[PDB]
Amino acid sequence: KSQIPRLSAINDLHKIWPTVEEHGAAIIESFLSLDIVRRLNEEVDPFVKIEPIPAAKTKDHPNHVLSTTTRLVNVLAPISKAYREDVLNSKVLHRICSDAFHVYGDYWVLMGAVMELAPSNPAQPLHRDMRFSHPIVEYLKPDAPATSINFLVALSPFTAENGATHVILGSHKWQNLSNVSMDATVRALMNPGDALLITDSTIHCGGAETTGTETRRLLTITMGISQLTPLESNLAVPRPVIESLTPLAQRLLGWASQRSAAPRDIGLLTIRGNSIEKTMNLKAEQPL
Amino acid sequence: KSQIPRLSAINDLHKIWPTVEEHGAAIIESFLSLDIVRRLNEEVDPFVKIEPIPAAKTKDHPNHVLSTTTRLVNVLAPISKAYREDVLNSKVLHRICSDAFHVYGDYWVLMGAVMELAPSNPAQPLHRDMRFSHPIVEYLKPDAPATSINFLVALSPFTAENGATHVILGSHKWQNLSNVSMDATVRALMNPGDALLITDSTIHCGGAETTGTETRRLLTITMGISQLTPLESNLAVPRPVIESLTPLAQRLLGWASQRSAAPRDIGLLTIRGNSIEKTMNLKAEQPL
Ligand SMILES: CN1C(=O)c2ccccc2NC(=O)[C@@H]1Cc1ccccc1
Ligand SMILES: CN1C(=O)c2ccccc2NC(=O)[C@@H]1Cc1ccccc1
Ligand SMILES: O=C(O)CCC(=O)C(=O)O
Ligand SMILES: O=C(O)CCC(=O)C(=O)O
Ligand code: NI
Ligand code: NI
Numbered sequence: 234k235s236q237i238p239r240l241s242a243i244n245d246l247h248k249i250w251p252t253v254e255e256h257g258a259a260i261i262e263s264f265l266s267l268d269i270v271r272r273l274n275e276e277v278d279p280f281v282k283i284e285p286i287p288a289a290k291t292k293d294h295p296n297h298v299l300s301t302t303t304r305l306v307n308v309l310a311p312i313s314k315a316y317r318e319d320v321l322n323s324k325v326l327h328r329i330c331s332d333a334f335h336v337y338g339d340y341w342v343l344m345g346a347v348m349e350l351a352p353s354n355p356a357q358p359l360h361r362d363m364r365f366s367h368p369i370v371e372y373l374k375p376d377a378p379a380t381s382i383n384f385l386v387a388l389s390p391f392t393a394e395n396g397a398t399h400v401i402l403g404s405h406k407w408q409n410l411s412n413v414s415m416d417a418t419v420r421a422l423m424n425p426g427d428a429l430l431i432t433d434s435t436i437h438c439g440g441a442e443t444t445g446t447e448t449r450r451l452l453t454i455t456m457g458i459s460q461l462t463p464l465e466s467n468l469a470v471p472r473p474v475i476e477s478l479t480p481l482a483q484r485l486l487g488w489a490s491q492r493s494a495a496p497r498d499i500g501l502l503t504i505r506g507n508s509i510e511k512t513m514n515l516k517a518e519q520p521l
Numbered sequence: 522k523s524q525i526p527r528l529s530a531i532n533d534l535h536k537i538w539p540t541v542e543e544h545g546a547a548i549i550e551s552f553l554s555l556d557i558v559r560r561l562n563e564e565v566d567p568f569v570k571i572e573p574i575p576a577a578k579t580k581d582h583p584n585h586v587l588s589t590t591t592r593l594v595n596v597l598a599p600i601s602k603a604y605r606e607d608v609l610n611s612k613v614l615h616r617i618c619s620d621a622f623h624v625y626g627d628y629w630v631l632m633g634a635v636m637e638l639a640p641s642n643p644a645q646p647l648h649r650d651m652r653f654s655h656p657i658v659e660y661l662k663p664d665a666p667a668t669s670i671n672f673l674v675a676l677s678p679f680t681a682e683n684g685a686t687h688v689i690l691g692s693h694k695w696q697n698l699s700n701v702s703m704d705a706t707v708r709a710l711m712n713p714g715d716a717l718l719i720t721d722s723t724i725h726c727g728g729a730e731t732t733g734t735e736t737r738r739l740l741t742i743t744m745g746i747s748q749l750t751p752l753e754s755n756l757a758v759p760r761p762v763i764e765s766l767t768p769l770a771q772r773l774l775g776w777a778s779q780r781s782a783a784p785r786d787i788g789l790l791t792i793r794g795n796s797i798e799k800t801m802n803l804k805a806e807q808p809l
């Protein structure tokens with residue numbers, strides 16, 4: 234059966250979104266450089282090691298869906314310099330997102346998370362994202378343009394044996410989900426820095442870790458229209474960190490007003506006709 | 522033709538949402554007491570007088586849709602004690618909203634605004650709300666439960682001659698909008714404190730001010746599911762003001778995490794499995 238289309242981030246930039254819209258998935262080879270992956274991993278390392286189980290009883294908002302052998306750490310801007318600078322300002326990410334969301338308007342990060350799966354982590358059930366946070370998305374018309382997309386960036390090797398992601402190609406256009414079976418999937422085999430890009434309608438799942446030794450890690454970046462509420466908050470991020478970012482990165486983290494694509498757009502998160510950034514006199518690119 | 526159903530806030534509380542869902546509109550008599558209206562008006566008075574035209578060239582996010590004889594002031598929590606305490610904690614408002622949005626989950630304020638229309642303000646064109654800020658809503662299925670509702674609270678008398686709101690009853694279920702005509706409307710005649718409640722699909726418009734002397738004022742409260750981004754931001758509201766509010770009011774203004782109605786909800790605006798309010802140790806009901 235047909236494999237997931239593979240595209241260069243360097244040469245095939247304009248082909249990436251059209252490919253995903255047609256097939257429901259694409260692999261962006263070298264989405265992040267090996268340098269950025271190294272720094273990213275180094276910076277988040279301790280935070281994933283201290284992370285408790287998804288549904289730990291200490292948590293206000295426990296995640297009862299993810300397996301107990303999953304560690305997910307979000308709100309990465311205060312943790313990681315590589316994330317807040319390099320990936321939040323990724324030229325490739327921003328071309329794809331503007332390609333994807335131009336019908337709606339501004340987009341932002343719904344969640345940037347590092348996921349690490351312990352050895353022998355079981356396969357996830359096949360699913361579409363967004364159904365445990367945004368019930369609204371299920372009420373969208375079948376042909377409505379995708380309101381969110383997910384970059385699953387490999388931070389270690391994705392192999393068949395260590396639980397590389399499964400996708401069902403074309404499943405983003407499925408209405409009837411009775412064809413849903415692991416029999417219909419193909420794998421996202423990836424080197425560190427490659428990204429699997431899917432939509433909120435692409436049926437997919439984490440793979441079974443079968444070696445019993447390897448630890449698979451990924452950076453999942455759910456980008457979505459600014460009209461939908463993020464899964465994570467950057468409200469508690471220190472102001473010196475926010476003010477070190479570019480204006481674009483600030484907007485992505487909810488530290489700016491937003492705009493819809495409506496011809497006479499009246500805006501989102503505004504303050505009596507003025508933006509957040511003006512009202513709070515928020516500075517940008519102030520180094521730490 | 523059939524007039525807008527009128528309901529008591531005291532006796533008919535459970536009938537209000539069912540009435541709106543059937544007819545697209547209802548008048549809630551004495552939604553706010555005359556005392557609350559007085560305090561509200563007194564507190565916002567100067568802020569509406571200093572408010573420039575909707576599309577003033579000083580503005581970052583000008584509103585090019587509203588007439589030049591309209592003054593709209595939003596982000597009312599820092600301006601008005603009556604708003605932040607009395608209306609944000611309105612028992613009637615919260616019963617109606619939980620009735621309306623239970624399929625989706627938590628709801629919050631998309632915009633709380635005082636609108637004041639100058640004498641001889643023209644009638645607005647018939648419209649549905651949300652189309653200049655949330656293009657996503659037009660892509661919802663026809664029978665999807667309303668994702669936002671609008672309380673248009675009279676802060677002065679609404680009469681036929683001074684531009685009382687027009688609605689088309691049943692128009693919230695319309696797909697074909699060729700029957701749209703001022704011929705099909707009825708008026709929301711209201712005393713101060715009464716509220717016209719409509720959905721995001723109800724076709725309506727501000728009326729023509731024909732006396733040339735009267736100034737009509739209203740408080741419009743767009744309540745919507747927490748999965749949709751507010752039109753206004755409370756990010757710049759002083760922390761002592763936020764900490765004076767109830768936990769419920771804090772959530773309504775985006776100063777708390779939110780929950781969807783999904784059985785294993787994973788939450789909105791969370792921080793590594795914990796809420797905003799915990800992470801920032803946000804206090805509540807600390808008087809000023
Ligand atoms: C539940 N869930 C997450 O927690 C998650 C994690 C990372 C990025 C996106 C994301 N969004 C989701 O909707 C998923 C869906 C899911 C996960 C496992 C098993 C079944 C369904
Ligand atoms: C544009 N517009 C607002 O500005 C507005 C004002 C108050 C509360 C809600 C609200 N939302 C809206 O979508 C309206 C829609 C509109 C207004 C006038 C003429 C045509 C359409
Ligand atoms: O583990 C993976 O590769 C996919 C994870 C995923 O799809 C999810 O958690 O939503
Ligand atoms: O003026 C009114 O009564 C209605 C105003 C309105 O519908 C709007 O501005 O969206
Ligand atoms: Ni997933
Ligand atoms: Ni309106």
